[PDB]
């Protein structure tokens, strides 16, 4: 992870 979203 480290990125966010949501998808």
Request: hydrophobic residues 0%; without cysteine.
């Amino acid at each position: 992870x480290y990125x966010x979203x949501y998808x």
